[PDB]
Amino acid sequence: SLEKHSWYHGPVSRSAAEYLLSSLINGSFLVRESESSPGQLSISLRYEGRVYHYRINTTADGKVYVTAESRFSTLAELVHHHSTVADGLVTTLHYPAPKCN
Ligand SMILES: [Cl-]
């Protein structure tokens, strides 16, 4: 299911994610699992020459969020929302990074 999204890259280290994003434009991003655990998810977001790593958090009622004030039933909805309004992030999730895979 998640791997069908162009923005979901699976397990990727912090350094590898930074490399993937390093020559891309503002708003380029990817969702990754940690390199060793599928349980730890982050969004890595290129903005103003740097890569910001946002932990994905989960609530008791099973929603996910990166901004406390905007929570969603699914990660696809979270990404879709922050693709048009930054809503707390440094910028919008505009351009899914091409997968190297
Ligand atoms: Cl960071």
The domains of the chain are located at 1-101
Q: Say if residues 47 and 25 touch (Cβ distance below 8 Å).
A: no
Strand residue runs (E) in the chain: 8-11, 28-33, 41-47, 50-55, 57-58, 64-67, 70-72, 95-96
CA of 53 to the centre of ligand 1 (A): 4
- Residue 2: phi, psi to the nearest 5? -70, -35
CA of 73 to the centre of ligand 1 (A): 24
CA of 59 to the centre of ligand 1 (A): 22
The CA distances from residue 4 to 1, 10, 26, 34, 53, in Å, are 6, 11, 23, 18, 22
Assigned CATH topology for domain 1-101: SHC Adaptor Protein (3.30.505)
CA of 43 to the centre of ligand 1 (A): 10
Q: Say if residues 91 and 47 touch (Cβ distance below 8 Å).
A: yes
CA of 3 to the centre of ligand 1 (A): 24
Q: Say if residues 20 and 28 touch (Cβ distance below 8 Å).
A: no
